[PDB]
From Swiss-Prot, chains A, B:
Its main location: periplasm. SUPFAM superfamilies: Cu,Zn superoxide dismutase-like. Binds 1 copper ion per subunit. Its cofactor is Cu cation; Zn(2+). This is Superoxide dismutase [Cu-Zn]. The keyword Transmembrane does not apply.
């Protein structure tokens, strides 16, 4: 009754660590133990599909595209904050990566429950997340760099 | 009915921006608009006293020492996570500062209410915060670098 989530770099295919998910009275805490990531803030969201495989868009390969879009059980069709309801329930606070490329700063998602997460995918993006679709869609996270399927 | 919190650098005495505090159904969101800070993660907590003045400890000057310790209304006498109850209610998630010395990443404190915050002080530390008293007390935040009194 622990279940940790192994994360794999989409570009190299090599493991980069794990993320521990735990339920508490305020939501789901995400405890990262990752490495080999670019320093800075990274878009971090739960995705619709339980897959980290690639997808295809107009002839281009989309790493981790098989995961689909941001988990949106309320069909909000919008990207926002982890503490706002009119947006993807999968929107989490951005994940911090140290100069040494390590991510260890835990983060909380008050709108989520652990049970509803299994079968979905955990995504880490190259860009950050300003929790808006402006000026860039999906908080500007851009490409997907790391992914893992919540079992 | 807005009330923003002006932050001042303890070492220079010059303003470094403001932090907006807002109440939502999941807690108090802290929206920073700061500058001139050292890149990286910084300990960020609500303090007991409503003052940012200095204090004195065994002959040494403690900038922002007049603010007292971490806000601890339940007398836990312990430092922990923003989503754990047996520790300072004033323990917030660490604040991120970009390479350009700017802090704009909002953060949420699920255990706090806006009303209980007025009259207290907002503190930003030099070191980070691993949300434990080990290996260093108070999450290793160390010295106080920026402070503001919640009006
Ligand atoms: Cu994503
Ligand atoms: Cu503090
Ligand atoms: Zn989203
Ligand atoms: Zn504390």
């Amino acid at each position: 009754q622990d279940l940790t989530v192994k994360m794999t770099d989409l570009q190299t295919g090599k493991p980069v660590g794990t993320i521990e998910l735990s339920q508490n009275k305020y939501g789901v805490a995400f405890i990262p133990e990752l490495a080999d990531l670019t320093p800075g803030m990274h878009g971090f969201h739960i995705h619709q599909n339980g897959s980290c495989a690639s997808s295809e868009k107009d002839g281009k390969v989309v790493l981790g595209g098989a995961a689909g879009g941001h988990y949106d059980p309320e069909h909000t069709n919008k990207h926002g904050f982890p503490w706002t309801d009119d947006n993807h329930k999968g929107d989490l606070p951005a994940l911090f990566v140290s100069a040494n490329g390590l991510a260890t700063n835990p983060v909380l998602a008050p709108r989520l429950t652990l049970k509803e997460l299994k079968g979905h995918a955990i995504m880490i993006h190259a860009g950050g997340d300003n929790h808006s679709d402006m000026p860039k869609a999906l908080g500007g996270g851009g490409a997907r760099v790391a992914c893992g399927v919540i079992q």
